[PDB]
Ligand binder design. Structure first.
Ligand SMILES: O=C1C=C(NC(=O)c2c(Cl)cccc2Cl)CC=N1
Length: 291
């Protein structure tokens, strides 16, 4: 059973980065001890507490249940003795995150490519929705590049399962929250739904078409609009008020009109009026077709 990886054969190669409750490492699974083994990505908890291990177990079950071209592949798990510490094994995607990839190559990635990635992100999100999963953390840093032609959603650390009887999930005690990607109802009532994920998708689209320019980031832009003097909880208070009054991220320089229209439709205060991921993939594929 190759979903069973012995921890002693996992050789540390590189620290890939940190996300929410965990860190990710590039490792070679090398049980022949001859450096010929498969290079994999390994997620583990920085603080393996009771609460976090339960959420992590749930995250693992989520990813394992997802099989789609635009979702990072689950490979297996590591169990440690006694205290039941858990490492999640996943495919290594050598081109790294879409955020770094875009920040590196900038405008050398043309609109053709950006919209391929957009389509692919939409398709992975639509599939996620059919499982009644809510990502809550859709952003270019959580999307990975497999090659020039393929991206995959790559982290599911905040993903929640909808209750049977509700179309939203309500987070009662929020931890670290990417508030500059959050829909107004997520800011005000901690309500997360397919529709709030669509809101965040519009921010990902903005990210893409700004080519991750630091001065143009959602945090830098929203902070400018509420005023750089706002701090801590007052940021959330002013952002809510900004969004209620139709304050929005600006159109990125050079952004095609029909792409910009999509962003602004995703950023609708009215939850029910936001497009669906099914329609977004269709629309985006139409635009690529025209090009
Ligand atoms: O090659 C990889 C890389 C992965 N994760 C990340 O790189 C990652 C980090 Cl380190 C922090 C936050 C978000 C993300 Cl997606 C997952 C699987 N295979």
């Amino acid at each position: 059973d190759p979903t069973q990886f012995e921890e002693r054969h996992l050789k540390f190669l590189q620290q890939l980065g940190k996300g929410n409750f965990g860190s990710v490492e590039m490792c070679r699974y090398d049980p022949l001890q001859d450096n010929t083994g498969e290079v994999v990505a390994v997620k583990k908890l920085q603080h393996s507490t009771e609460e976090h291990l339960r959420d992590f177990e749930r995250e693992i079950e989520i990813l394992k249940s997802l099989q789609h071209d635009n979702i990072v592949k689950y490979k297996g798990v590591c169990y440690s003795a006694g205290r039941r510490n858990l490492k999640l094994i996943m495919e290594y995607l050598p081109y790294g995150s879409l955020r770094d990839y875009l920040q590196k190559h900038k405008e050398r990635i043309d609109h053709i490519k950006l919209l391929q990635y957009t389509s692919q992100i939409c398709k992975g999100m639509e599939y996620l929705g059919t499982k009644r999963y809510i990502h809550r953390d859709l952003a270019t840093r959580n999307i990975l590049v497999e090659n020039e032609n393929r991206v995959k959603i790559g982290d599911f650390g905040l993903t929640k399962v909808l209750p049977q009887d509700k179309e939203y999930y309500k987070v009662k005690e929020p931890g670290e929250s990417p508030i500059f990607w959050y829909a107004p109802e997520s800011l005000t009532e901690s309500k997360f739904s397919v529709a709030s994920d669509v809101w965040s998708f519009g921010v990902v689209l903005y990210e893409l078409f700004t080519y991750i320019e630091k001065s143009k980031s959602p945090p830098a832009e929203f902070m400018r609009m509420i005023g750089n003097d706002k701090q801590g909880q007052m940021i959330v208070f002013h952002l809510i008020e900004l969004l209620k009054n139709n304050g929005r991220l600006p159109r990125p320089d050079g952004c095609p009109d029909e792409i910009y229209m999509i962003m602004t439709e995703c950023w609708n205060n009215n939850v029910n009026q936001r497009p669906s991921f099914r329609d977004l993939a269709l629309r985006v594929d139409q635009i690529r077709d025209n090009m």
